[PDB]
Amino acid sequence: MGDVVATIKVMPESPDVDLEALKKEIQERIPEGTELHKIDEEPIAFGLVALNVMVVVGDAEGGTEAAEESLSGIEGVSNIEVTDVRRLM
Structure with missing residues (x-):
């Protein structure tokens, strides 16, 4: 502890919720700041099933801001x- x-839960608006395809995306x-989790x-x-992509951060930095950045143009269909x-803690 x-x-x-x-945690980021991405889900495609369309019924073609390609979970495995979403995996690559x-x-x-x-966030280019650290790494993912699970x-x-x-x-x-x-x-429509979403994927809750968590991320493990600690010794990293505020460079994870890249996540919100990519959000400005992320999966427009998958909010x-x-x-x-x-x-x-």
Whole structure:
């Protein structure tokens, strides 16, 4: 208990929620500041399942700002619940 873990839940608006295809996009959307953690295959709409891509940060820096940056032009179809957090203090 001491690591800061964030959580980004991305979900495609279309019923063609390609989770595995999103997997590749997830890696490229990850904050260039640190590294990822572990993703979650959780459902949202009637059949649209999102992926909660968490990230493990600690010795890193505020370079994770790149995440919000990529959000300014991220999956326009797959809007993310970019409000999840997990402060493991």
